[PDB]
Amino acid sequence: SFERFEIFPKTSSWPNHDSNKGVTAACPHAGAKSFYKNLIWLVKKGNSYPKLNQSYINDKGKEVLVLWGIHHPSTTADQQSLYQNADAYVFVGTSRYSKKFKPEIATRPKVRDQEGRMNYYWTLVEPGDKITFEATGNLVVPRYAFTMERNAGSGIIISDTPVH
Amino acid sequence: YINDKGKEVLVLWGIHHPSTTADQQSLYQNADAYVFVGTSRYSKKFKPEIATRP
Amino acid sequence: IEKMNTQFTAVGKEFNHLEKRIENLNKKVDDGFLDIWTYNAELLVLLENERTLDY
C-alpha cells in the first residue's frame, strides 16, 4: 500500500523561510527554471536564516519513507548568498538514526552547467516514532513523504517492452 | 596498553554525544573535544555530535 | 514437472561500482546454479529417455 502524503504543508510550516525561490536552470520545465516538487530548497528570507527546527510524528499504522537533501555550494560566496552563514550544520534524528552533515564548499567539475552538488538521503520511520530535522542552512527540506507497507520483495526490470 | 598475552584481545570503548551544549560543558568542561584511538592496524578520530535526539 | 519447487524470488541484484566484489560473488553464484541445473537436467533427460525406451 503506497500513498503520497503531505508531511509538511508548504504555506504554513516555514514562515521565516522563503519557498517561492530556489528554482534552478539545471531542472528546467517548459523552458523556465524549476525545481523538484517533493522537496523544497530553502533560501534565506531577507539576509536572515533563522535556525530551522522541525519535528514529525508517525501516527499512521504503516512505515513512512522520508527523503531530504543537503546542498554543497561550489564556492563560499554562493554559500553566503544562499544561507547567510559561513559555517553551517545539519542534523537528522529518528529513534534508530542520528546523523550530522557538514557542507563541503569546493569547485566540482562543471557537470550539466552546474558546479555545486546535492546529496540525497532517505530514511524509514516506523509507527510510534519521531523524526526531527535541525539546520542552520544547506538543507533541502522534505515536502511529501510516502506511506508504505513493504512486501516480500521483488526486482527491477529494465526493458523497452510495452505494457499490456 | 601493550598486548603481552599470547592470544587476541578484544577491547570495547564508547563515545558520548550529549543532547545539548550545556550538558557537554557541565560534563566535560570543554566546548570542543576530540577522541583518538590507535592500534597498529587501526587509527580513528571521533568528534562529538551535539544535537537533540528524540 | 511437479517436483520442481518454486518460490517467489527476484533473480538479479543491482550493485554500485564500488561494490564490485559483491557483484562478482553474485555472478559466481548465478553461474554455479546455471551449471548445476544444466548438468542435472541433461543427465535426467538422458536417463529418463533411456529408461523409457528400455521399459
Side-chain angles (χ1 to χ4, degrees):
Chain A
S1 178
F2 193 88
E3 294 182 5
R4 178 169 172 265
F5 175 76
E6 184 176 0
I7 186 167
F8 292 153
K10 184 177 61 181
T11 180
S12 301
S13 300
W14 336 110
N16 299 332
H17 294 58
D18 178 71
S19 60
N20 304 332
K21 298 190 302 298
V23 299
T24 178
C27 303
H29 188 13
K33 301 181 300 180
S34 299
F35 198 68
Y36 305 90
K37 293 184 176 300
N38 303 17
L39 307 177
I40 302 180
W41 185 6
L42 302 179
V43 299
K44 64 177 187 180
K45 182 180 180 180
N47 59 87
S48 299
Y49 196 97
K51 175 187 300 180
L52 180 127
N53 174 86
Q54 194 66 21
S55 60
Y56 176 80
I57 313 298
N58 182 13
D59 62 333
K60 307 179 185 302
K62 303 178 182 301
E63 304 177 0
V64 174
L65 173 64
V66 178
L67 328 175
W68 71 100
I70 306 300
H71 175 268
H72 306 269
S74 62
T75 177
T76 307
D78 184 67
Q79 164 76 9
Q80 182 65 25
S81 179
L82 289 182
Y83 310 102
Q84 206 70 17
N85 284 316
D87 188 7
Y89 66 99
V90 184
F91 169 70
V92 178
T94 71
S95 62
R96 298 168 51 187
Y97 186 82
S98 179
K99 187 53 185 177
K100 186 174 183 179
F101 310 98
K102 298 291 298 181
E104 302 180 0
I105 299 179
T107 61
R108 279 76 175 179
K110 188 176 182 180
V111 178
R112 203 184 299 266
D113 303 330
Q114 288 296 333
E115 297 80 8
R117 286 298 183 272
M118 196 174 298
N119 306 15
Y120 302 139
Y121 307 89
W122 67 271
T123 188
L124 290 178
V125 181
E126 299 181 3
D129 302 335
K130 177 190 303 181
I131 169 174
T132 59
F133 296 93
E134 182 178 358
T136 62
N138 305 85
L139 174 62
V140 182
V141 67
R143 188 187 170 185
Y144 285 80
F146 304 98
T147 301
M148 68 173 56
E149 177 180 358
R150 298 180 294 100
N151 203 328
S154 300
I156 286 86
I157 285 180
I158 302 180
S159 61
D160 203 6
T161 298
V163 182
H164 288 54
Chain B
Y1 176 80
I2 313 298
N3 182 13
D4 62 333
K5 307 179 185 302
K7 303 178 182 301
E8 303 177 0
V9 174
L10 173 64
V11 178
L12 321 178
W13 71 100
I15 306 300
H16 175 268
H17 306 269
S19 62
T20 177
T21 307
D23 184 67
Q24 164 76 9
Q25 182 65 25
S26 179
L27 289 182
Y28 310 102
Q29 206 70 17
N30 284 316
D32 188 7
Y34 66 99
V35 184
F36 169 70
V37 178
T39 71
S40 62
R41 298 168 52 187
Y42 186 82
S43 179
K44 187 53 185 177
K45 187 175 183 179
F46 310 98
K47 298 291 298 181
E49 302 180 0
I50 299 179
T52 61
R53 279 76 175 179
Chain C
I1 296 181
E2 182 183 3
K3 287 306 178 180
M4 180 61 57
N5 296 17
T6 59
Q7 297 79 4
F8 191 92
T9 180
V11 183
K13 307 299 182 180
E14 304 181 9
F15 297 101
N16 201 333
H17 62 277
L18 296 178
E19 307 173 359
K20 189 71 62 179
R21 302 166 299 178
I22 312 180
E23 179 182 356
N24 295 329
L25 173 58
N26 176 83
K27 290 177 68 273
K28 179 183 62 178
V29 170
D30 193 9
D31 295 333
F33 283 164
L34 173 58
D35 297 327
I36 293 177
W37 279 120
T38 299
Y39 199 62
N40 187 22
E42 288 286 350
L43 295 182
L44 172 67
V45 166
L46 298 186
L47 291 180
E48 289 297 333
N49 294 333
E50 182 190 13
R51 293 197 65 87
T52 305
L53 298 183
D54 193 10
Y55 171 62

